[PDB]
Each structure stands twice: as structure tokens, then as C-alpha cells.
Amino acid sequence: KGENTSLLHP
Amino acid sequence: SASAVYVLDLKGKVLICRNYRGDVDMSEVEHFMPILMEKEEEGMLSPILAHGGVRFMWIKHNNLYLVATSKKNACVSLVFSFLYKVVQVFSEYFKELEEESIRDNFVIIYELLDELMDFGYPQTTDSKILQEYITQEAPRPPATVTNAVSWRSEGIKYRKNEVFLDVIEAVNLLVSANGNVLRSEIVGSIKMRVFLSGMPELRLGLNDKVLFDNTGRGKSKSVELEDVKFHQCVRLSRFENDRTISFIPPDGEFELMSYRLNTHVKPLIWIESVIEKHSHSRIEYMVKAKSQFKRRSTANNVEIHIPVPNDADSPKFKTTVGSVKWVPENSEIVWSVKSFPGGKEYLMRAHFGLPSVEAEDKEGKPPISVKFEIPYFTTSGIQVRYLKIIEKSGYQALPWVRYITQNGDYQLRTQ
Amino acid sequence: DRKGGSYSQAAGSDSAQS
């Protein structure tokens, strides 16, 4: 996928 | 002389590849996608690609591009024929041509690809022969491929010997915007679904103009096909010698002969279109359809497609016979008629608005095409004389044939 | 019945051609 991941991971 | 034939995907992923000569690296497939993308964006895209000194010929399949990379000056026509044969074999084996069956029958697909061609030279091309030696659910190769008769498998036994023929007629009319027909050619199609016992040798006989002239009976209605192509089982020697269409019928549906000649008769359906399009105010569709065919023949499922405006909305249909439906995806209105008897006159009056803002770029004037199909009609007038079904054992065959008349390239140029 | 023209029986050869 790779879309549900947070843009900054915070 | 393609180095390796591979099946690509819509995203550029190669569904399956099989090198035949090894003179072309398998990494050239990755560069094929960028080359195709560049060609499409610049209008230089062609089926036969060229990656440096290696040409990657590709064919647009149902879901993947059948890229057949080649290195030397191989036969482009031979490569295209091999690709077409592979596509036909895949369609016969797998009813679906997409990524679902590409990755589902890889075990049998690899074996079929290996058996089909070796060293870039195809060896097996018969669907029945391939299925008789390679299956997805192995014995020695069948003797039919080694034997001369590779299109009629011996030993076939059936309870009844019934052959279903199909006299398919394609009426193509190229009517320009001025109202005159430019390209008016009718291509015949003699396809028979022979299902009998054994390997009978069909003796095709029809009311051919050349045959009638040779026999001295050139006074009745005879079909004079400009181009006649025999099937694989049809012996070309007999046809060249005395027009004798003698060949072993195949096991199943096959195309024996396909006539192709120009047509000098009036169109089956005469469609006149009127475009009362206002300047960003409204649009008028004065579409009138006249049936030029015989009244005894009815055009079943007649769909005269009239291209409506691209930005047109809120359309109103005022017709007499046949339902009119506007499909936004097609950007046109098709005058669909369930039954269209010959001589019928259908008049339609379209009316729809247009947006206030004018379009930024033109959309063109696609030609208006109809989908008329009147079965049991022989526009060419060619009548089959007899079908010589002869078997060594000896049996009484009951062949059948039906004449179907449809509309092919019957496109009328827009005003 | 069948759409596109009913199937009709076909002969074996031209009986008038000998």
C-alpha cells in the first residue's frame, strides 16, 4: 500500500 | 525472428516471458515501457518498437502488451503471425485474456510457450493439437502434427454428423459528409462448425461467378468475390486448377472461405442526419433513417449511433420508431431499434442545451455509424450449391447453414 | 429458432452440372 502510512510518522 | 516473446501488463510488468534465441537480454523489457510512454506522448508510438539495435515488436492485447523483442532483421510478418497464433491459442485455452489467467496457468503456459516455438521458429500452432499434448489438468506428441493432415484429427467419433454453417455478411459503407458513398465493400464469411465422425473431406460448392462461367451456366445470379481466401484445410491446388474447394473439415468451428468484393448496390439503411446546433444555445438532431433493404427482411437490433455534442446536456429525444438513449460515456445518441423492417422510415428530432462557456478546443466530427443486422438476408445473392461430405467409412451427413447479414464499416461522415 | 437466419439444409453438389 504505502498510502495509509503517516506523512511524518508522529 | 524475434529473440524472445513475452507478455507484458498494463503497468509495464511482464506477466510471462520466454526467450527463444538468447541473443537479446531480458532487461530490455523494462526500457520498452518508457519508450512506449514517450512515443504515446509524442505520437510516434508504433507496435514495432526499437531499442537500439534490438527491435521490441509489441501487440496490444486485451490486458497486456505481447512484446516480442527481436535483434536481427527477422520476418516482421512472421513475428506478427506467430503473435496472432499465440493469442488465438491462449484464447482457446483460457476464456479470459487478462492478468487473472496469466498468473493462474503459468505451469501450463510455460509448457505451451516452449512447445509452440523453438529458436525463434514456431513449430506447433494448432489449438486442438496443442491441447491434445499439453493440458492444464504428458503423452507423446500426436501423429496429426507429423502427418500431412494437421487440421483434421483422425479417429474422431460422433453420434450424429451435423455441421452448422454460417453465411456471415458484413455490409460496410463509407458515406462522406457530401452524401456520397466512397468505400462500399461487402466481405463474405463462410464459417462452418463441422461436428461429425471421422475426417470427412468437404467438397465446397456455391454459385460462384467464375465457376458458373467455367461450367457454361453464367446466366443466373452468381456471387463474384473479388478476393477469396481458403482455409488451412482447403487445398489451394484444386482451387487454382478448377476452383474445386476440396479440403478436410476441421473438428469444430472454422472459417473455410471468406469472400471479399466491392458492393455497387444501394445501402441497406439510408441514414440522413441534420444538425440544427445553435451558437451555444441549443442543438438539433434531425436524424432520419430510411430502410433501403427488402421489406421481407427486418434489421434486428438496429442501432444508428448519432454523435451528440461533447458538452451537450439536458437532451430531449423526439422520435417515432425506436428508443433513443444518450450515453455520457460514448458522448453520442444511438437510435436503438429492436426490429427494423425493410422500407421503414424512422424520423427523430433531438433537442438539447449547451453550456454558456464555449469549449477551449475542438472535439472533431466522428462519423455516424449504424449497427443494423438483418439475418436471413443475402445481399450478395450468392447461394451455396452443395457440400460434398465424403467419408471412407460411409455415412449420411446433415450439414446446415444460415445466412446472416449485418453492418460492418457502415459509417456515414458527419456534416 | 435462432437470430441471424435459421439454419437450412445444404446439398452435396450441383446436380444440374452432371
Add this chain to the structure above:
Amino acid sequence: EIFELKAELNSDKKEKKKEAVKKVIASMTVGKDVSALFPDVVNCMQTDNLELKKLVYLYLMNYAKSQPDMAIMAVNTFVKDCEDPNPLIRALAVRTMGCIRVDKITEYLCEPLRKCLKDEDPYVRKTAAVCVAKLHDINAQLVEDQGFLDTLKDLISDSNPMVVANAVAALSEIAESHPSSNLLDLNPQSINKLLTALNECTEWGQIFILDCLANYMPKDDREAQSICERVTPRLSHANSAVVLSAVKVLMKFMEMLSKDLDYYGTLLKKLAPPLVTLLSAEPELQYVALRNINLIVQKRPEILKHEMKVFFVKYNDPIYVKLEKLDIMIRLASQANIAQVLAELREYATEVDVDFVRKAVRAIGRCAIKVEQSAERCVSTLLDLIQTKVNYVVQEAIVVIKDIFRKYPNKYESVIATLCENLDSLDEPEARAAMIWIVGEYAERIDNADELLESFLEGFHDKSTQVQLQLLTAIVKLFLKKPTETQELVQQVLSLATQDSDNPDLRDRGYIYWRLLSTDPVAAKEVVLAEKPLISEETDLIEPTLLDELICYIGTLASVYHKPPSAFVE
């Protein structure tokens, strides 16, 4: 994953070995480097199951170049499988032996190749011929040492007509890469034997049979007539490649055929229906058919003289197909179908493809230039295109008018007034230069030539080198013809192109014009405004030497590219 697969492959369970092989095949197809497991699968190679044997052979072939050292543990297995009673197993082993790109692997496979050369099974014979051809391609010296040329030559005059065709194709491929020394050419008995087996060959074997005749050069009219008669039945074959090969063979044989004999006329008459049938083939083969027609058009243009309706581009035809149709119509354009060509160009000019519109305009201009009977029709079409209010269409019309003026300007004075005010604000260099040249050369029917050139003189020093040269030439011509209204304009142009022009060629031209004006203005009319001779248009026909060579190379990649076979291969 990898460890589990290796453990499964190193087990004694047939189901587990089959599952491991299927997983390895799926990983290899999905893009997984399974070459590291090749040595593990080497032990699990001699299996009774045919499905596992095929997968093992495919893995070895795909993992042979990656691990040539690990491929040395399969020579014994290949030798054992080469004597398998099942013809399918023997054919698979023969194919795998020739498909393995190992220098030391083919050396040990020479004995199996020799053993399978005399295989009685036609499939076995075809596999042996393919393996011999592959070995010769990989190692010509090894093939010559093994003496496979004699076996390949004798396979042609044997049974198994498909096997005979395969052997003939292999021999031609060996000779194709050969330097032509010790060719496999056959006498007329060999040609007759091939023709007799041509009718019994399959679709693939027909192409191989016809390829041999392409290299043979007939020497007698009777032999050529017999070859043409034999190839005539091939024109009624459903295979597009077979039809193309037959057409190429007939064209090659027509080179030695006599026009006095009726055989050439019959071949030409029977070729037109074949061309018509090929023109209605699939889009992939449509380009090949168009290229073949164009290549054969320069040889026998009278064959397709009446083939003009089919040359029209269909609405659903592709861009390449439309371009090929337009090129065929331009090459096949004639005064008989001049009206049809003009109507197609006018209809083709209403399309939304800019490239297609430009191609149609170029074809219309070429037809107008080639045939002077349609010069008025071409001028009217160009005027209509200009009045259509299309930037690309207007530029194409201006270019066509400029080309016609340089070619047929005797009766081109009736369009100067129409072209004088024809949306001349376009900044396209091709249209601007053409308009400037037309104004300079045709500065007689326009009373405002100086006024029109005044607007183009605002940026003469920075418009372009070719544009500046054309403007200077037009100014010089106007001064020579009418210097009363252009005496100051000529001086201004000379000053701009002589002092403010830094171009070397442009500066030299301006200096030469100024010197001619200051030396003898009367002589400038006879020197600058001289009557140029007839313009020699570039002939689109290929050279006769290339046409003859292209006739033999029919259906190859060179015909589509329109390049010599040695100028396109790497």
C-alpha cells in the same frame, strides 16, 4: 522461505518436490532471483514426472548462464533423457540442450545431437534440426566440425514435411549467418521437391519453404513460369505472412520474367486481389502490408493503379495506419482519382490530429506539385484551408502556396491578393519565410508590398537568419522592381542587415546586395531579379539498386523501416 524451499526440494516426497518447483517457478516469474537454488534443484532433476522435468529444464535453461559452473551436473541427465522412449521427452531434451548457453555444454551435446539428427519421429527430427541450428548459431565451428550441414541438407529431401520445412529453415538460418561460402543452394529438382511439399506443409512450414525460393535466382522463363504458377495458389492462403511471402517471391521472380509473355500479366492481375485482402488485415499487420505495398509500388506501380478506394484512411484506423494510407494515396495519386484525393485531403484536413492535418496538407501540396492539372484545385483547397481559421491549417496553406509559387508561379498571380491579407500576423518561421518569399518574388500584383514588408522589417535584425535573409531578398527584389516606393526601404534594410546584423552569412549577403545596388542598379534587375530555371523537385522514389535489394527482403524488419538490411542490424 529460501531455507524451507531448499528443505522441501531436498526431500523424498513427490508432492513436496512438485510444490517446491511450482513455488520456485512462481517466484522466478514474479521477479525473484531463484538462481541460488539451482544447485539444490540439480539433485532433484532426474524425476519420472513430466511436469517436474519440464520445470527443471526451464530452470536450468534460465539458470545456465547465471551459474555455468553448476550446469556441469546436468550433462549426464541430458544424455539420459536424450534416449527417452517418449517423443515429447526427447524433444524437450533436444530443445533444452540447444537452449543452454554453455560453451562446454554444447561440446558434450554433439553426440546427442548426432543421435537425434536421424530421429524417425517428425517432431524429434524438427527438434534435432532446431538444436543443430542453435548449436551452429552459438558455435559455427562446432557445427561445421560435427558435420551437421550434410544432415540438414538431406532433411529437406525426406518425409515429415513439417520436419523438412524446419530443416530448410535451419539451413537457411545457418547460411544467413554464414559468409556465403559453401552455400546450400539447390538445383531445380530441389525447388520442385520443395514446391511439391509446399502444399503439404503447415502454416509455419509454408513460410520456411517460400524463404528458400527467395534466395534462388531463376534463369529460364519456363522455370520462372513454373515457379509463378506454383506460388499463385499461395495467394489464396489465410495466413498473412504466407501471403506476404508469396507476394515477395512473385515480385522477385518477376525480375527475370518477360513482359511479352502473359504470365506477368496474370501475376499482376492476381496480385491486386491479394493486396486488397492484405489491406484489410489487422492493425498490427496493416503497417507491414502498407510498407510491402510501398516497396512493391516503386517496382510495379501499374499493379495497384485501380486500388484507390481502399487507400482511404478509415475513421477507426490508427495514426500509423492513417499515415501509411496517406503515403500510399500520395504515391498512388493520379489524375483519374485527383478529385477523390482532393476530397480525402479536405476530409482529412478536418480531423483533430495536428500531425494528421500537417500530413494531409503535405500530401495535398505534393499532389498539386506533381500533377499540374490539379494546380487550380490545389490552390482552391489551400485557400479554403487558410480561410478555415486554423493556425496550423493556415501555416500549411501558406507553405503550400509558397511551394507552388516557386514551382508553378506562372498562374499564381491570382492568389497574391488573397494571400496579401491572409492573417499574416502568424510568427511561424516556415509560414513567415514563405510569405516573405512570395511577396518578394510576386511583388507585382500587390500594390502594398512595401507596406506589408514594413511590418516585417520591425524585427528583421532579430527575427531569424533564414527569415532575415528572405526579408532582405524580398526588399532587394522590391527595390529592383519598384524602387520609387522602396528606395528608402532598401536603404533601411541594407543598414539594418549591414551594421546591426552580426550574422556572417547574413552580413555577407547584405554587403553583396549593397555593393550591387551601389554599383549598377540596372544590372541588379538582371542579376538579383533574374528568371530562375525550373525547380528540380526531390524525387521520392528509391534508387533502383535499393529497390531490387528490397524486393528480395520482403516481410523483414528492413521493409518496415525502409532501410537496407545491413544498415539496421547491430
Add this chain to the structure above:
Amino acid sequence: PIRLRELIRTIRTARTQAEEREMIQKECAAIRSSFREEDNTYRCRNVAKLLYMHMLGYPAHFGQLECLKLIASQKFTDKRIGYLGAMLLLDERQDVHLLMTNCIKNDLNHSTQFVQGLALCTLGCMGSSEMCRDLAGEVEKLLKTSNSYLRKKAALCAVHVIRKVPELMEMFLPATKNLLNEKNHGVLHTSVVLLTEMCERSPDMLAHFRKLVPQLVRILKNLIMSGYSPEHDVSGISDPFLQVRILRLLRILGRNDDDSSEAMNDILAQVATNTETSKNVGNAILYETVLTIMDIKSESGLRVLAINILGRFLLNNDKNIRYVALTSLLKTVQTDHNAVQRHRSTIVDCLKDLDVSIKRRAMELSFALVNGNNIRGMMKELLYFLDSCEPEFKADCASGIFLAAEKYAPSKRWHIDTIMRVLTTAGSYVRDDAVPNLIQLITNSVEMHAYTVQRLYKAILGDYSQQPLVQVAAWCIGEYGDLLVSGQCEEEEPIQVTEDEVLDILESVLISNMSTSVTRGYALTAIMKLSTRFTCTVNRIKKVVSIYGSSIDVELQQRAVEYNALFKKYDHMRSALLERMPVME
């Protein structure tokens, strides 16, 4: 009423491009049908679907009147949708925003802050020449308001109006007066941006805007002192945008005055040492301070500190840091040029860096650092870089080498040799415009013609596919045929030029397929000039000119006809118009 989420899901569900296009066309047809009935209940969903289709690459010309109608509506959602449509699908060239002026004027006095703020943002984003003319008074009225949330919007609108209409900045001079004491960070930033824009637009307000230099210095000092703040404090830097704006104003303020630089000298010194560049914000602040110091009349110590900071940032392994250092060095090329020479090794190494931007910056720094003493030494490095450069940098490298040779060439012979080497090695990378410059340089130089003529003759016979090199060789032959071959009137001893090889080369170039109609014209002109320039090969070029007079090209055919007419009727007058062209700078 199809929701935007449903349309997005439907678009995502399509895989084939044709299917997605068909779905988009169906959605657009449904939206147009809904709009044609004057629907106002589900107008927001239709507007969202139209915006999504336009963003995906679908036409939205028909969805223009609906946005205008929704703009003059009363619903907050409808007003927001109309504003978004005007911002996205509405532009100056669209011409549909003319009717939006009345809606903007009506909404400019709206009591709601969101409506007024949205209208101001839309006007700023879609600022037009005519819209700003009828909206300049409204923007100035809101500039004097005390609304902190609206002060920034008013400042942005004024800046946009000034940028679109530079003549309207005269009405903003008294509106921004006494606005440097705003407590809000946004209002102060907007005021600083407006002042900087006014100063950059015209220099008349520089003196008026330079009086607030002490106030700006005090504000910057207060911001630096408050290094911690819940708002605007990111990565340990409080108000990084405000600090950047202050640094930019200081650099642009008093750039040619000593009082302005002296007043901000202490602030610049404190910032150069009281700021940590560990994070990206700190590095950006340090780079901005260094740029302001370099662009202003700062002290020697400030310049030394800026040079040291630039050198330290040059050694940083970060690609962004290296690019920033290269840009700072390129900007500080003329200023502190002697101090920039210490980074010659770094500049040379940057050309071999694996970053396209870094390599370009290094090449630009090397080109700008070429002087009258390192030009000879740097010539070999430039030639090596051009030979082993990227395809997009080979032409740029050749152009830079040619510019350096023409500007700071150590000698005409050395410059001529460098130009010849560049032409031979550039091949197709030599710009066509540089051909006239090379021709002018060759014509100006009248001391090195025999060696140059011989080199051009040698380079022309070997290859002729290079359009710039071929044109240069043809021009050199036409200009110095009398010097390239000496004593070639009749048969003589074997030399480089025999009076027949040049004519054959010119004929081959004219008839060769590798001609673009420009080199062919130059070759024809050279051949015509060689009739009087060279007296050895006579009576043979006339036949070629007569045959060449029927060329396909109209200009080429006319030139050939004129040459043939001159040869056949003005043989005695051929030399009367073959004088050498004047040489000028």
C-alpha cells in the same frame, strides 16, 4: 447528489485509463445536467465533484457559471465552494472573473470574518489587472483595521495588488505608516513583507522605509532574546519566518548606505554568533544572515564571518547544505572575490559531485571564479569537465568556456586554440547563436589567420556533420582563402591546400544531406566569394552555381540563380562586390 467521497471511491475503483475517463465523463454529464436545472441544494457536492474532475485532468469549462452563481450565494458551504472554484478554475486569462468583481465587492464588506477572509484570499490568489483596479480602495480600507486575523490578509492583498499593479503602491504609503509595533507575529510579518515589497518595487520609499531601521533592529534583538516560544518555535528557532523576514529586510535595507549597515551591523554580528545551525531553520537563518551581510556594506569582520560560515557549510555532507553554500558562493562572486579563491578546490570537487544541482552550482562557481590569472590554469579543468560532462551540461560547459575565452582569454592564439578545441569536441553541443559570435571574433582577429585557416581546413575535411563547426570552417575559408593556400594558382608542390580540396569539400557540404539550409548557404557564399578570392580554381564553380540554381529551397534556388547570373554576366564585376566585410565589436 453524489458525494465527493463517493466520486473519489469510484475514481479509485477504475483501473484502465479508458474506464476512468468514461466515469469522469459520466460524472461531468450528471453535474452539467444538475446545474442546467439551477440546483441549489446539492450544489456543494456538484462543485466538489467538478473540482476533483478538474484536478484529475478533466475539462471544466461548463462548470464556470455554477461557481459564479454559488459565489453570490448566502450559504457558508456554498460560498466556500464558489471561492475554491474561483481560485482553482478561475484565472485572469479565463475571463469569467469579470462578473466576480461585484461579488467580491459585496463580500468585501461582509460582517462574517470567514467570508471576508475567504474573499480576500481569493482576490490575492487570483489578482487581476482590472480586478485590483476596482478593488484597490477596498484593500486599502482594510489595511488600517485593527483585526489581527485580518491585518495579515489585508497586507497580503496589498502586496498582491502592488505586484500586479506597481502604480497602485502610492496609495499604500500612508496605510502602513506606524505599523512596526504589532504584537501579533502574523501582523508584524505581513507589515514587514509589505514594506519589503514597497522598497523593492520603487526606491523612493527606501529613504522613508529606512527610518524604521532602528525599530526593525530592536524587534530582531527582542526576537533573538526570546529563543523559546510555544508559538512559532520550531526546531529550537522561535519565529523562523519572522527572523528570515528581518534578515531579508536588513540585507535589502541600506544596501548602498553606511548608516543602515552600521545600525544593523551589531544585529548581524549577534545573529551570526547567537544562532545555531544544527537544524534546517538555523542553517537557513545563518545563510540569510550571510547573504544580507554580503549584499550590504558590512564590516570586514562581518564579511570574514560570512566567508567562514560559507566555507563551513560547503564541507557539510548534506545536499541541501552544499547547494546553499554553492549558491552563496556564486552570489558572493564579485564581492569578496579574493576570499572566494580559497574554495577553488571545493568548487572543482563540486563539479564531480553526484548531485545534478550540486554539480551545476559547482560549474557556475568555477565559471564565475575564472579570472585573468587562473583562466589559463582553469582552461584545462573546463575542457576536462566539458569532455566528461553530462549531456545537459556539455553544451553549458562549452558555452561557459567560450565566454571565458572571449572575455578573459590570455591570448588570441590561446583563445583561438581553445575555441577550435571546443568546436571540435562540442560537436552538436555548440549553440548555433555562438556561431555568429565565433565568426565575428575570427573576423576581428587579423593576426592569426594562416594557422587558424589551416586548422579550420583540417577540421572541415575530417568531418562535416557538426553544424556550428562546419559553419565556422566555411566562414573562415570564405574570409581567408587567400591565406589558407599560398601559391595555389597552378600546379605546385604537395601542400595542405591545393586549391581543389576546398572546392570539393564545399560542393560535398552543399550537396550533403547533413545540411539545415544555413550551413549550405554559408558554403554557397564562400564558394561565390572564392571566385575572386581564389584565382586557381576558376571556370568550375560557375557550372556548380548554375546547376545549384534549381534547388528545391526557394532561398537556395534564388541564391544559386543570382550566383549563376553574376558569373555569366558580371564576371568583371564579381570582384567589385567581393570586398571584405567590416570588422566591428
Add this chain to the structure above:
Amino acid sequence: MIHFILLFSRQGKLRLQKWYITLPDKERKKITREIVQIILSRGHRTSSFVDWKELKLVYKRYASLYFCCAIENQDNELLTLEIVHRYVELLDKYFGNVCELDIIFNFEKAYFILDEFIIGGEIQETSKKIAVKAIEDSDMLQ
């Protein structure tokens, strides 16, 4: 100021687009395609800075969807990166665990946040809490 800011995914799909310069639709599409190709054809060690068309084409994506900025050569390069990071943080705070799927569904919300944050390519809200509070108040209005 920022000439244009567009958020494009790794596969090339554009999730956001905001250009502050009036350009033709065809020209804008061509520019966006060229920017995507340059970003898609650039490595991770290119410094995230590209000088295309005399514009500071800064590409810096913290996830599969990347972001691009176009500013004139008159300010520091780190300022654009800091502004992009601040905008990303503000969007994440406003939404909460912002992902690629949420960006497509919240295109209107993202556009409104971008408009309320930067107008005309210039910074309008230096603080991060004031802009979030204003966006929340505007959303709560209805």
C-alpha cells in the same frame, strides 16, 4: 513567493495543486508533468533542490506522496523546506495521522488549510496554533 505548490504521489498521481501564477491550462498541465518527471527521475541524494526554469524546484516528500515547491531565486533555500515542514505539521495536526487516502478524501479541507495558511505564495500565518484555531473556527461555522 511560491509560484506553485503541488503534492504528487510517488506513482505520479497528484494529490494537491496550488499555483499562484496565472498560466494556461495546457501550459500548467505540461509544467506539472515536467515537474513530476523531474521529481520521479531524481535520486534521494540530489539535495531536494532543482533549478528548473530559473525556479527553486524543491522536492521533499516525507512519505510516498511527495511535495514540490517553486519559488524565485531571492530567498534562502532552507526557508522553503521549513515552510513545507510547518505546513505538513499543521495539516497532520488538523487531520490526525494524515495519510495518502485521507488526503484524497480531504482535498477540500487541504485546499482550505493551504489557502488559510499561505495566500499568493507568501507566508500568512507564522504561528502554528493560530492558523489551526482559525481553521477549526471556520469549519465549525458550517
